[PDB]
Design an enzyme around this catalytic site. Structure first.
Site, PDB file in Angstrom:
ATOM      1  N   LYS A  79      -3.302  -1.565  -1.997  1.00 13.64           N
ATOM      2  CA  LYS A  79      -3.269  -0.114  -2.156  1.00 13.64           C
ATOM      3  C   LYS A  79      -3.572   0.729  -0.906  1.00 13.64           C
ATOM      4  CE  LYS A  79      -5.251   3.571  -5.099  1.00 13.64           C
ATOM      5  NZ  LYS A  79      -6.068   3.844  -6.316  1.00 13.64           N
TER       6      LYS A  79
ATOM      7  N   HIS B 250      13.523  -5.752  -0.380  1.00 14.20           N
ATOM      8  CA  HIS B 250      12.985  -4.577  -1.017  1.00 14.20           C
ATOM      9  C   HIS B 250      14.159  -3.673  -1.297  1.00 14.20           C
ATOM     10  CE1 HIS B 250      10.689  -1.058  -1.754  1.00 14.20           C
ATOM     11  NE2 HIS B 250       9.698  -1.879  -1.952  1.00 14.20           N
TER      12      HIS B 250
END
Lengths: 416, 149, 150, 416
Positions: free
Chosen positions: D142, D258
């Site tokens: 994060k 991705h």
């Protein structure tokens, strides 16, 4: 949400700014939606974007603009691809918004200076080509055919008076024609034309390739053969490849022509995706000496692009599609290329609309060389008329009709 | 703000869809504040689409003021007020108003406000004299019943 | 055959007169057409109108003379595809059919009458209905409206 | 148009087929629009596409499908970029159509065999990683200095995840330079592998502004012994992606793709390119893993998941598959589920995707190792339950609750 929408923030000189247009899902306030965009596109209280201004789109319901600032530190120096993942990576998939479009970006000087910019740029490109006082001409070869016959068509058209001849954007290397031979035969056509006419002529050889190594091989061969300019598709091939080629070009003295194939996929719909003016700025930073912008014969938006890719400084003006004042910090411009639906009848308008710093790429003449002749004459007549003081948007019909009497090639074109 | 008879084919310049939700004067501001603003003709069927359903629907032929309104379109029935029954009664009325142009900016322009009973139309200057810079709707046209004689 | 006037783009500039019809759909069926209000009371000044029954869908049509002539008993039927309804050729486009229930009796041999077909709703020539001895129909088609074209 | 729309044509085994959806401008017949799509996307007698079938979209007004064949010779062997400019280069900008969307492409075996395909593929990857009988797990960190980032990586891998991922927007920035990230991450991996006995890795982002930098980053990751690297194929471009994939095969490095910025071109349902097309294009270009996203339109999602994993997929319009696709023994790509997922969805994810997948999770009440533990436990519990015939779509609540009785970490997660 209130940690992102900050109605009382003044952007810094180093901030990257972006303007988005959006339509929120029913039940979602405009401010919350703006805050969300800033959040999705950013994050450490110095690593977050801030939404500083939200206003409705005049004349439309459920349609708003939002202005978001992003700290300089979030962007990799010299990298278009990093700027894009940061700004457009996931905001378009965000659930509280029905649709989202990116309208504009202000690149702070501090970031502009980390990019190469165009290999050569407009003024250098004119000096290299030794062409002044006018727009340049070219066309695309039809049939869009062996390398030998292809080379003959190229020769005749360049010899006939065009400055540039272009490869079909979809032909890289195919069973019926392999690039190595196209390159040899085209180069011969150019060399004969230059020797005969005394001018500098080129051909937009397509060096688009499946891999970087292949792209370089094609580019290296074009250099070996003495080709002044090469072509590449920046959207399909992408920015990593485009940037790489642009660097190569600057090191090696080759001009780079950028085609905009597949842009429609990204920006045609007015309410979703990325406006081409953004892509145009991104390209100016990545590389490219020439860029297809397309013709108009929205006018206001088109004029906006042209200044954005050519001027040193553009003042914000919402009526022209420019949201932020953009200072290019002496980075050179990109020469726009007009195309699509054009022939000599539109020559007056094209000259007045784009001025001298442009290239006109024409489509079929009833008589190749007579085509080149008709356009070369029509252009020179229009430029001279403009300098004298005629109004090309009104007198254009007479300028062409008179010119048509000097050269029957032009009359033949005008007659249709 | 023209007053037009419902009359067929006076000007020959075209023929197409245009709808405004109807309110009665007796209803008051509440009905006006609730009528659907966005009435969107589309698809190919061209059946009009309203953001919300409305009981009474009237259309005003696409004369230039009506076409100009777009969002905020409303139509207001007005009913008279004869001292003498034998004296001819004034005709029923309808007011095409732009609720989008709620703000009072034009002195000449009439605006829709609320009377003690029902609604009323007041000059912009009068409203500014009374210090009301706001009105429900801006009247763009006046009414008159189809007269064949 | 069937009178066909096509609605066109840009026709919104200046319509001097316009008329309103309730809307029924092919999916909605014959029942909806019976349900639609027949009498639209004109207490109009420049158009003010009230309907004997409340109706969800309304089409605004220009005062083309055939549509204007109908007055009471005027309805518009929405069709997803023109070909199925039209006995003749179609352009694969949505169809709007204006029908007058007042003249539903089949008296016009060349007249077209909306009827309940097994598949759904169809426009049938009067002579054909007379061959099958069908004395009555849903409505008599007065006009066929085609969409605006760019 | 009669030279493009041919209602009685049967496609050849070597033809490339494409399925488009469109809405024609009002007054434009569907057939004429279909013929135009074929012409715009091909020459416009053996170099032209043919529209062979047109049908309405059920339930949708003014919306049609068109099926167009293209001869094998129109495509450069081994090149995704050429296929795309030929098919989607400018057809989307065509004036007679309000909107155009590409739904599907059938790649003939003859063309599929000219592409590399995934560097390793599903079976090879399991063998290289020595991981069998289950989905793989990972997460994104994060938040940092390279060392702090390395500590976070260590804890997450040490605690039980198979992979840790770099934020997609961090390439190299003033606050953190890639070379240091690579060193500290690599150290974290090596410590975790040594301590647990398993194979662990990290999806180092090697997306870069130029092909040379991309290679430098990839080479460094190889020197450090990193088993896997990451790249953003849509932002970077297909030329760059393909290049990296070839490198990856030669050097034994798994490639993770991705999908950032996909929303820009596939989110709206009436314009642009459906993700399943991009997914096929990628399988041909390269990449071992591809983000698919989560489901917890599952029909359409599952449709492309099979298209990128299976050898032979029969056409099935209810799943969004328009053509039968024979992959001719080219290896498949592991889907990666991500976004909006936590242990609560573990049952569903296991049943929906099966074993050939990766599940990426976004904090846990007691920090990162408990985080990793809770996910590892939840997954194993779900897989073992599936193997016993338990219905994960209904019993999933109990499977997780029972697991929570032996694992305090999982219980802490389930508490919320």
């Amino acid at each position: 949400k209130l940690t992102y929408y900050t109605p009382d923030y003044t952007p810094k000189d180093t901030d990257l700014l972006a303007a988005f247009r959006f339509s929120p899902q029913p039940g979602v306030p405009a401010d919350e939606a703006g805050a969300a965009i800033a959040a999705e596109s950013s994050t450490m209280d110095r690593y977050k974007g801030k939404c500083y201004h939200i206003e409705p789109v005049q004349g439309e319901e459920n349609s708003y603009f939002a202005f978001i600032a992003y700290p300089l530190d979030l962007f990799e120096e010299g990298s278009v691809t990093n700027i894009l993942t940061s700004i457009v990576g996931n905001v378009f998939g965000f659930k509280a918004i029905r649709s989202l479009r990116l309208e504009d970006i202000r690149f702070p000087v501090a970031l502009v200076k980390t990019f190469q910019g165009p290999p050569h740029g407009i003024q250098v490109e004119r000096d290299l080509l030794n062409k002044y006082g006018r727009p340049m001409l070219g066309c695309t070869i039809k049939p869009k055919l062996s390398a030998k016959n292809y080379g003959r068509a190229v020769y005749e058209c360049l010899r006939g008076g065009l400055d540039f001849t272009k490869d079909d954007e979809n032909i890289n290397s195919q069973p019926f024609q392999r690039w190595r031979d196209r390159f040899l035969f085209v180069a011969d056509a150019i060399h004969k034309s230059q020797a005969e006419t005394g001018e500098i002529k080129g051909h937009y050889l397509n060096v688009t390739a499946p891999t970087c190594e292949e792209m370089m091989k094609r580019a290296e061969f074009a250099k070996e053969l003495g080709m002044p300019i090469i072509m590449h598709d920046f959207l399909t091939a992408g920015f990593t490849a485009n940037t790489t080629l642009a660097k190569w070009c600057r090191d090696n003295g080759v001009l780079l022509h950028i085609h905009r194939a597949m842009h429609a996929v990204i920006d045609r719909q007015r309410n979703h995706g990325i406006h081409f003016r953004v892509l145009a700025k991104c390209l100016r930073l990545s590389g490219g000496d020439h860029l297809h912008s397309g013709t108009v014969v929205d006018k206001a938006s088109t004029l906006g692009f042209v200044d954005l890719m050519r001027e040193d400084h553009i003042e914000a003006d919402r009526s022209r599609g420019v949201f932020f004042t953009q200072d290019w910090a002496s980075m050179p411009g990109v020469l726009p290329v007009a195309s699509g639906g054009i022939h000599v009848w539109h020559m007056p308008a094209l000259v007045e609309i784009f001025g001298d710093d442009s290239v006109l790429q024409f489509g079929g003449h009833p008589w190749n060389a007579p085509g080149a002749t008709a356009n070369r004459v029509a252009l020179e007549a229009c430029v001279q008329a403009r300098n004298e003081g005629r109004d090309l948007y009104r007198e254009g019909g007479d300028i062409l009709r008179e010119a048509g009497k000097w050269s029957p090639e032009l009359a033949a074109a005008l007659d249709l | 703000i023209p007053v037009v008879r419902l009359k067929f084919g006076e000007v020959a310049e075209a023929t197409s869809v245009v709808v405004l939700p109807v309110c009665k004067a007796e209803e008051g501001e509440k009905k006006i504040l609730e009528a659907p603003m966005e009435i969107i003709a589309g698809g190919d069927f061209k059946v009009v689409e309203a953001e919300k359903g409305w009981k009474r629907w009237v259309v005003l032929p696409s004369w230039n003021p009506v076409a100009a309104i777009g969002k905020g379109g409303v139509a207001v029935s007005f009913r008279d007020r004869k001292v003498l029954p034998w004296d001819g009664k004034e005709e029923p009325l309808l007011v095409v108003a732009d609720r989008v142009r709620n703000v009072v900016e034009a002195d000449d322009g009439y605006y829709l406000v609320v009377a003690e009973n029902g609604l009323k139309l007041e000059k912009g200057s009068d409203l500014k004299a009374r210090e009301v810079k706001e009105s429900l709707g801006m009247v763009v046209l006046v009414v008159r019943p189809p007269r064949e004689d």
